[PDB]
Amino acid sequence: AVVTGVTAV
Amino acid sequence: AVVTGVTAV
Amino acid sequence: AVVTGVTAV
Amino acid sequence: AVVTGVTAV
Amino acid sequence: AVVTGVTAV
Amino acid sequence: AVVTGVTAV
């Protein structure tokens, strides 16, 4: 699995 | 700002 | 700012 | 598994 | 600022 | 596993 999470302000 | 990031496998 | 990052396997 | 988490302000 | 980072396997 | 976590302000 390739799992990528980005959270930005 | 409240910024919350969760990345899980 | 409250900034919280969690990365888990 | 490749797991990548980014949390930014 | 309160900045909290957790990286776990 | 390759696990990478970045938390930034």
Place this chain on the structure above:
Amino acid sequence: AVVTGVTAV
């Protein structure tokens, strides 16, 4: 600032 980093296997 309160800055907290945890990296674990």
Place this chain on the structure above:
Amino acid sequence: AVVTGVTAV
């Protein structure tokens, strides 16, 4: 496993 955690202000 390669586990990398970065927490920055």
Place this chain on the structure above:
Amino acid sequence: AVVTGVTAV
């Protein structure tokens, strides 16, 4: 500033 870093295997 309160700065706390934990790296564990």
Place this chain on the structure above:
Amino acid sequence: AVVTGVTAV
């Protein structure tokens, strides 16, 4: 295992 933790202000 290669485990790398960086906490910075």
